[PDB]
Amino acid sequence: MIEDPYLGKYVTCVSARSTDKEILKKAQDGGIATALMVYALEEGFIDGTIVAGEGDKPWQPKPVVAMTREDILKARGTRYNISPQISWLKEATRSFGLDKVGVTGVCCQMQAVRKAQLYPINMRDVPGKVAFTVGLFCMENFSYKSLQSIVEDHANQSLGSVKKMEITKGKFWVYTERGNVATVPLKATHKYEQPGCHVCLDYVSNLADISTGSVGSPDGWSTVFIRTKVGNEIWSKAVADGMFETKPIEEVKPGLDLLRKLAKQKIDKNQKTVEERKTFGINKGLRNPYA
């Protein structure tokens, strides 16, 4: 068990991509989040999972309890605006009748699940029915109006034409279905970020069973942390079953060196913000949820 001060607690870290070519056709990166949930369903580690499905406006996610391989695949690809994944957490155990709930989401959503497991506050039956969590890396998120403003104004693209969006190499990238590419400098996006992201002290989904993301791995690949006993059992079985190609992370460039550095910048910048809240006023401060 490595206990990293910026990458959290984990057993191993590899670079990986799914061997399911259908999944990879529309996965954001390696298809880890989709492949892990499909496999968990077909093997019976879960009987349903919360995923960011398609919503009612283009590129606006809608949380949904998926119970088939087909419904899980609809959630492929990154939506860079808020998806309130945890709103279906209790309901998954009520009208859906699930015994083994999967949850996907970003770092704060992993935190929400773990708080619910230890301090269930009107969350009956949830502690014991959470079966598997896959956490995405997340530097920051946006309101939907923020995302519209970035894509339509700054990138000058129509949302109905966008095939993929990607934050990497210092730019917000927009790919269209007809084959065009537009970029926006990340400096331009800063005003649009969701303010509650600025106290977040968690980059690589420290509290998930398995965490997955893009940084540290070449395109089409994911950096994966296997963290908990649940996470290790499922990953071992999946690898043994042929579900994934892997490479130890230290044989991969830029790997864990860059990743640990981006995690450190996030925590340091946001810890400072948390500190300034304390003296925000005159002889008064703002609340610290971590106090």
Partner 1 sequence: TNKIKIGHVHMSGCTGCLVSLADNNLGLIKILDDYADLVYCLTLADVRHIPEMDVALVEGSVCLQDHESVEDIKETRKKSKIVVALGSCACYGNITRFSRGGQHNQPQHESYLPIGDLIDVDVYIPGCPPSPELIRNVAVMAYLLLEGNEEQKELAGKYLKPLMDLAKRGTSGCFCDLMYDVINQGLCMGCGTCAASCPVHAITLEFGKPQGERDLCIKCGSCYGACPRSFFNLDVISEFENISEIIAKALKD
Partner 2 sequence: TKVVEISPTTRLEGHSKLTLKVNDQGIVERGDWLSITPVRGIEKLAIGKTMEQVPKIASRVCGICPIAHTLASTEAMEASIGCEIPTDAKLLRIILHAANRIHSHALHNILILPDFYIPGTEKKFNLFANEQPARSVMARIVRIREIAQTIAAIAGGEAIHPSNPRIGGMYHNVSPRAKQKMADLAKECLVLVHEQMEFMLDVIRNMQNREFVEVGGKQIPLPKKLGYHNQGVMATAPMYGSSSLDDNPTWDFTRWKETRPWDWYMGEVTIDLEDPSYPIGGTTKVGTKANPQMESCTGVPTYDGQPVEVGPRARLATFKNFDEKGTFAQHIARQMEYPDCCYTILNCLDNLNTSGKVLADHIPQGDGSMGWAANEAPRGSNIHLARVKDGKVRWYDMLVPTTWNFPTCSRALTGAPWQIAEMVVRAYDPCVSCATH
Ligand X SMILES: Cc1cc2nc3c(=O)[nH]c(=O)nc-3n(C[C@H](O)[C@H](O)[C@H](O)COP(=O)(O)OP(=O)(O)OC[C@H]3O[C@@H](n4cnc5c(N)ncnc54)[C@H](O)[C@@H]3O)c2cc1C
Give the residue ranges of the annotated binding site for FAD.
28-29, 31-34, 52, 77-79, 81, 104, 139, 203, 214-215
- Report if residue 60 touches partner 1, rule: CB under 8 A: no
What's the CA gap between 186 and 272, in Å, rounded? Answer: 21
Contacting positions for partner 2 (CB under 8 A): 145, 149, 152-153, 156-158, 160-161, 176-178, 180, 191
- Report if residue 276 touches partner 1, rule: CB under 8 A: no
- Report if residue 106 touches ligand SF4, rule: CB under 6 A: yes
- What does the block give as tokens for 93? 């155990």
Q: Which residues contact 248 (CB under 8 A, 6 or more apart)?
A: 14, 15
Nearer to ligand SF4, 20 or 63 (CB): 63
Nearer to partner 1, 99 or 153 (CB): 153
Q: Report what 200 binds from partner 1, ligand SF4, partner 2, none; CB cut-off 5-8 Å by kind.
A: ligand SF4
What x/- string results for residues 2 through 41 when contact with ligand SF4 is judged by CB under 6 A?
----------------------------------------
- Report if residue 220 touches ligand SF4, rule: CB under 6 A: no
Q: Determine contact, residues 27/76, Cβ cutoff 8 Å.
A: yes
User: Minimal CA–CA distance to 259: which of 213, 219, 227, 228?
Assistant: 213
What's the CA gap between 234 and 11, in Å, rounded? Answer: 13
User: Minimal CA–CA distance to 99: which of 74, 59, 126, 79?
Assistant: 126
Nearer to partner 2, 179 or 289 (CB): 179
Nearer to ligand X, 253 or 278 (CB): 253
Phi, psi of 17 (to 5 degrees): -155, 145
Q: Which residues contact 208 (CB under 8 A, 6 or more apart)?
A: 110, 133, 134, 135, 225, 227, 228, 231
Residue 161 CB, nearest approach to partner 2 (Å)? 5
User: Minimal CA–CA distance to 134: which of 29, 240, 290, 276?
Assistant: 29
Rule CB under 6 A: choose which of 15, 20, 30, 207 binds ligand X.
Answer: 30
Residue 22 CB, nearest approach to partner 1 (Å)? 36
Beta pairing class for 222-226 and 130-136:
unpaired
Residues that bind ligand X (CB under 6 A): 27-34, 51-52, 61, 75-80, 83, 85, 104-106, 136-139, 141, 212-215, 222
